[model samples]
Target: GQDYSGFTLTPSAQSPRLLELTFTEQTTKQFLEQVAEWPVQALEYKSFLRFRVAKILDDLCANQLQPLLLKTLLNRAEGALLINAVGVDDVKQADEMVKLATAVAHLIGRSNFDAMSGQYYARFVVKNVYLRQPHRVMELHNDGTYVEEITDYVLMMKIDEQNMQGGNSLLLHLDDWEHLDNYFRHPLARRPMRFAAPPSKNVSKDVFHPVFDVDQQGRPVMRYIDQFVQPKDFEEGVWLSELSDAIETSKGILSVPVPVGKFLLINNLFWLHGRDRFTPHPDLRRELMRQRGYFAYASNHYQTHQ
Candidate 1:
């Protein structure tokens, strides 16, 4: 139902909930040129400028981009998007990549302050040939789980990859997972569970919440991550392990290969995300960037079904 002059849209092969959006080379070039003066560093220092650039981008698209993005992301039938710009690739262009991603994110919401980087966004690298790497599985979880703020969207971009294999982006919508009702109706669904973070996250205290929640439409949604969750006792610990296993083995999981310069944006409340293990190679290297944020519109309009 979505059509734009300079972009092509199609449902991803992995699932109808996931859409692939590609911007033509000419469109991308025009966007970059129009916003050429706004550097990534400047946006970092001046938060309001982020919204300004977002307006610029939407204006270039005849103001069609924001409404489409908001509707698709908030819809229960479709909540994921993989976006890319033609002729823009490689780690050397990471700054440009960040700028483009920033524009897209600010259109629908304001990104939260990322504790991992002490900024609104974060960028990190994953190297190959490592054992029990920190990058493994990241687990099927939601963003902003530890904070009191509500994060409605997540944007992740792959800046570069070298000598890599098998590490595909993993995604699962709550409704698609067959076990959604089974788990959401369970007694543990509403119980508060403890969540903590590694020193790297720079969050010292533990937070608490139930794994399962409901959206405005009364559909199941989730906020979970294996590494950060802290069970209070043996019962909570064992049950959480089972829950984790169920999610990991879910048949609805989509293994998406995000090529350099492409990004995955999804509604964080209803979608769980992770990464597959990559094959070991001496020169394997991958770099990624991310933004997590809350919607700009009235939160009261979309009540939490829980």
Candidate 2:
């Protein structure tokens, strides 16, 4: 039972734990006007300005947006959100959409600085044919796997998609995996294994951590990806291979098609996110944007999510 006064949140058609929040078109228009002067560069140069936009957005909603978002995202029982604005639903409005998502994210916490480049937002394109591996599909895994930072929240928005088929998002909650308990009890679950970045040099040499971890509430959470985990020994490699297969075959996954301009925000601790394979077409094109941050409520204090 959500109780926000400015907007309504209902269980998404995909799952009860996933909620949908949409802003009224009138409110969306007013938001654009209030922050029109501050270009994306303004927020990029001044970190505090990001939160200022967040406050202005909350004010427009009678100060209800912040509290509702915090409650929903922080609440342990439910943590996934699919959000969008009514009028700003086209790819042509990409800049406008990114600004809105940033404002909303900063309301809960500042995004981890180490994660963002000098700038905090990343917008990348997915075409039927990219520079490499047009036929490749991404695997399911949590963000910030190699880093020790607390990735409390993850925000992914679909700016545009055209001439595309298949390639929906893949999501599997840690609690929903049928083999979760069986694997969680295994000795390898707690073993500290090495994780290395691909040839892209996304990180330094290598990192060490377990695939599975227990949250503050004692619930299980994971940090794994098929391509990056470099299993040290045969025993570890065999177990990891089995674990990957288990995750891919889980029936609890949701094959969700995120329409243009819609986005998903989930508590990164418990949810794993991935992209499905595209049914390639010569004209296919998809553009996306992302923001990952840890939860912080106090203006004077900050702590990454556990």
Candidate 3:
């Protein structure tokens, strides 16, 4: 029958490359009550507890949710998901929201320590490691571009929003891009380049890697960002500039709006995500939570969790 016990799964209206997964209110209510013993504080203080909660949620789904999540995130054909709990869609439930997201994330991977927040997850109005500015678009790019860890997946949840207009989440799959081969085939695509984090991110050392790489299947993948990549010379600079132009102008980018308590979980390897610009508003405020981590399962990729 292909049914998940406590959840419903379907392709997103915007793009088939993305799936929409929703937990029924009955499932959400039961999960909240079962997980209430550990506050969000507990999960933060004890890393092991995060996996404990993940086990609870997977059990509630009859042990089916974890496999479904792992398969979806690893499948290159459809590597992204939009998820939410039916009754957990308010700012007041922010803590619960975090718990839910933490459970889902750990079921397949271990979240990295976020230097920006001193926690595994970051709650903010934005990331450039500057997420609050509403007037500008955070261009399409992958996470972990400037870090040493293998960021196999990215989870971003919306906790709150006020007087906000525009600011939709943008996504692009490598296979869907109009100019993927144009850049992926360029020699610079595999050339190791330096990536440096801004002082605010608290990561001082520079990382070196090419903007693009491939999976065991020879499928295209990327770890790139215009903000952090340091072009060494005129040649690299112009090549990168053109690459950026190609990406930004791509018509394949999906504009998805994440309502409060909802999130987008995506494969960081082949999927690039960003945010659209918002209309200016004096009282504009949007609170978001994000976690980036490496998948636990090993199959053609490095396993960060033992």
Candidate 4:
């Protein structure tokens, strides 16, 4: 029906908590034209214009897009989105990818400054090369844990990929964690600890916070990453070690394949994201992008400010 605008929304087969939304080729192609003139630099310079393009996209969707998106993001039953636009799926369309992702994100809120790229969005490449004895997995963690920025939602776009084998995006919802109750009820759940990123991240200051917190409904939530998180004492260290193990082995984790042109938007408070090791290919190349920002309606919900 036209009730949902021009977008088709459904539950992702990987997880009920992850919703799949498709913007038809008609809607997608139209947006590329409407937003054709606005350079990525323009949006980067006049941040307000980001919202303008956001509205344009929504209007083309009959205005049903914005409300449905906002409502779905806040819905506990679903806080993650797997968005795809039919006509826009190739590396040559990198510019379009950034713009589309930006428009969708701004409809929600202003994106945070990405220190890595010195822009509102960060685009990077992942190539396979083993450097050490242990091939490691990008451990599951919430973004913005090391920085003071109050990041609410995270948007990740797959701009390009070639010769990629198995570097699937790993996702784990807090409610689905088998050890959530045991860990959330711990004494150190609310105890302040330190988190600081390496110089590579371009952030030099340390922030203090705990691993566990709750949503407005008092539901268990977390802000944790195995790396960058600094434990205060022997107890904190050991507990975090065991906690990491539990999370790494969680059966609820979903391995999602994000083909070029698709982007994943997730509520940062309750969902932990990671990357799995992939087969080493001599020509493997994967270009991905990310945009992290506060939620427009998240101020009072995550209890982050409180």
Candidate 5:
């Protein structure tokens, strides 16, 4: 509905639901120079500075970037964006990349403290792991399912990729799924279920919430993952298993490749995300940075988990 000067916005080739937003080289260069006064560490140490960096980025785009980001992320029809900068596509610029991503994330809302990394963001690498099970897809799921904090949005950035083949990202919008109505109407959809993470997730407590919920307008939304959800009885177990198969086989999934220095910011409630299996490569390597948090506006007001 609006236009910004510094970045170009277009619908991704894969789907109209996913938008491609790219910052021009000139804007990126100038932004980096202007923000050079503070490093990623500075933003990490001082929480207020994160918003300051967000302000600088919006100012560069004539103060139009923030509204666009907020609108796109909050809009149900188009809640996913593949964002990148022109000249920040190398691993050596990882620090700058982090700063750039941070600015964009803080523009819409504050990032929650990620329990896995004990910081606002977490950077991790993948190498030769997916090779073990070629048939196993990461499976479609939502983030923050096992945590108490609300995860309104998820930001995943690719810092590096080498010798990688066919490991594109997979996304499925709730409304587009053919089996959504079938599953949403089931009696088990709203049943409160227990969710617990493994040892590596650093979460000790189990959380309970239904697999599906409705928004204020009564649209279906989800918070589900096959791994974390623990089924106590046979009914819940069988229903959940069937629901998983339906989601995995849905034809609405989109396979997207996020290059270095690029990221995917998606609304967590209505969109499910996963990874496609990769062909085995001996020297395969991939590094990613992620930040998942709730959207805040006006005195810590967040989108409620209804």
Candidate 6:
């Protein structure tokens, strides 16, 4: 992989399919200073300003950031990235964290309006102790599964954490999963199934799609969510249950620990993501922000649908 002047790019230790992108302290400071005027509130009010800030960040990298991010994310060999900017840690700077992620997301593509937040991006908090006991595994699934819009990319940032333990982000590449062939070759691979979200998701209608589909190259891709999937019958329910089990137990799953100020950006089509359960602590506090949307480029294959 080619290295930018102030950025280091390498395959993550946990998996060759995931890349670790680290920007030098000088680079981070310079990039932040260049876009200091644009805050999260600004981007939220005027969407175009998001792209303007993105252009500023790319310019600071000598116009190399955009191309690098686009190429790395679209490449099937490695489509997941763990990114971080220096000195942007702590819960106090949570708003700044959201601004940085919004910039990156808009540069690559337009983020879809998130129903949960009624905006293009969403920010939420997770306490060490919660109403549900926090035992739920977020599950390996893609974003925008219940929506009609195509979600090409997903960006998740860790803004704050206190007395937290065991809640690493989990990721799995479609190609790396051991059971890809078994599921892709199955007859139900192309069968459409219903997907509906809870009242909180603000999605009233149900979406129908198979667990596995293919890209132009005929490679397997997935759109699944454990919480929203509605099996129509016994057969569908059994198959979906089995598929979920296969994904959860896959050895290729990567347990990525993203510290404060770090984020994970990945290709949503070929990557499945989740979160591990966290240990309980009375003062435990974790805040995360996310943006999910399609890519912006002139590639023939990707643009065919448009």
Candidate number of the best lDDT: 3
Candidate 1 matches the true fold with a TM-score of 0.92
Q: Residue 300 in model 5: shift from native, Å?
A: 14
**Which pairs clash in the backbone of model 2?**
none
Q: What is the C-alpha lDDT profile of model 4 across 190-262, one tens digit per residue?
A: 8989997867544477899888877899998788988789988899999999999999999989999999999
**What do the candidate models score in CA lDDT, each in turn?**
0.84, 0.83, 0.90, 0.86, 0.89, 0.84
lDDT of 1 by residue, 1-306 (tens): 366866778998898889888877887888889878888888999999888888877787888788878888988899899998887888888988888888889999999888778788899887745335635664687877776667899899999999888789889888788877877888988898887767754456777888877787777888888777888899888988988988999999999999999999999999989888777777888899999998885344555679
Model 4: what TM-score?
A: 0.92
Off by over 4 Å in 2: 1-3, 113-118, 128-135, 199-205, 298-306
If the candidates were sorted by their lDDT against the true structure, best first, what order would they fall in?
Answer: 3, 5, 4, 1, 6, 2
RMSD of each: 3.6, 3.5, 3.3, 3.5, 3.4, 2.6
Task: Give the alpha carbon lDDT tens digit for every residue of 80-193 in model 5.
Answer: 999999999998899888989999989999898876777899999878664247456899999988876668999999999999888788999997899999999998899999
Considering summed lDDT, which 10 consecutive residues are worst modelled in model 2? 128-137
lDDT of 2 by residue, 1-306 (tens): 464544567888888878898877777888899999999888888999899888878898899999788888877667888988888888899989988998899999877653335468888787747424645657778887766666888888999989988778888887778999999999999999888765533546678999999887888888887777889889999999999999988998877788888899898888888878777778888888888888888445668998
What lDDT tens digits, residue by residue, belong to model 6 across residues 1-306?
557866778888888888887777887788778778877777888999888877877787788888888988988988888987777787788876777777677778888887879888888887747325677677899987876666899899998888988899999999889999998898988898888867854446777888788887989988888888788999988988999999999998999999998899999999999999888888998888888889996565544554
* Cand. 6 Cα-lDDT: 0.84
Q: Supply every candidate's count of residue pairs whose N, Cα or C atoms clash at under 3 angstroms.
A: 0, 0, 1, 0, 0, 1
Instruction: Rate residue 237 of model 1 by lDDT.
Output: 89
Model 4 lowest lDDT segment of ten: 127-136
What TM-score fits each model? 0.92, 0.91, 0.93, 0.92, 0.93, 0.93
Q: What is the lDDT of residue 93 in candidate 4?
A: 91
